Design an enzyme around this catalytic site. Structure first.
Site, PDB file in Angstrom:
ATOM      1  N   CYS A   1       0.423  -0.924   0.078  1.00 35.94           N
ATOM      2  CA  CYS A   1       0.128   0.283  -0.199  1.00 35.94           C
ATOM      3  C   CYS A   1       1.254   1.003   0.185  1.00 35.94           C
ATOM      4  CB  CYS A   1      -1.212  -0.235   1.527  1.00 35.94           C
ATOM      5  SG  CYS A   1      -0.244  -0.237   2.602  1.00 35.94           S
TER       6      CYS A   1
HETATM    7 CL   LIG Z   1      -1.086   2.635   4.482  1.00 37.66          CL
END
Ligand SMILES: [Cl-]
Length: 177
Positions: A94
């Site tokens: 991410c």
């Molecule tokens: Cl994150």
């Protein structure tokens, strides 16, 4: 910043957890024989997509206290298993590889290793200290853990995965906790 510029973390032989940097490091990826990538963000690009090398899967999520990550577990799990099923390595990330990515990996270790939510959390944490899912995600992982234990979710315990040595290190590590 600070300790946050960490190195790509190897959770399992075929599973790596990193940040947006590791997502761009084409050298390491090819070196580690990465054939799959999971991007747990909505705004970051699927780096090296054009290059047509790896297979991708985005889980369009933000690190908000309102985001639903459960909805993606199943999906992420298959993609991880597909990469496993065929000698390829999978890199999941991410932004900081701190909250979203981690929640997915912890959840994974839970579903495919009857490991407790805390054991999985500690395990991943042990290998990647910066790890820190948010309370929203923590609760979802709690619910998930309950769901697994009550059976409302098919806990896949197929030896289809890990070899003996892998399971041993895994077990040995949990013993440390
Ligand atoms: Cl994150």
């Amino acid at each position: 910043p600070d300790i946050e510029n960490a190195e790509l973390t190897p959770i399992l032989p075929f599973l790596f957890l990193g940040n947006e940097q590791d997502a761009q490091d084409l050298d390491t990826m090819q070196r580690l024989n990465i054939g799959y990538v999971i991007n747990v963000t909505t705004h970051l690009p699927l780096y090296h997509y054009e290059k047509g090398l790896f297979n991708y899967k985005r889980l369009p999520a933000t690190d908000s206290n309102k985001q639903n990550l459960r909805q993606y577990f199943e999906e992420a799990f298959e993609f991880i298993e597909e990469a496993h099923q065929c000698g390829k390595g999978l890199l999941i990330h991410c932004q900081a590889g701190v909250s979203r990515s981690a929640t997915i990996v912890i959840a994974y270790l839970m579903k495919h290793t009857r490991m407790t939510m805390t054991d999985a959390y500690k395990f991943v944490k042990g290998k990647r200290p910066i790890i820190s899912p948010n309370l929203n995600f923590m609760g979802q992982l709690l619910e998930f853990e309950e769901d697994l234990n009550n059976g409302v979710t098919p806990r896949i315990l197929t030896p289809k995965l890990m070899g003996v040595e892998t399971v041993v290190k895994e077990a040995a590590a949990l013993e440390h906790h």
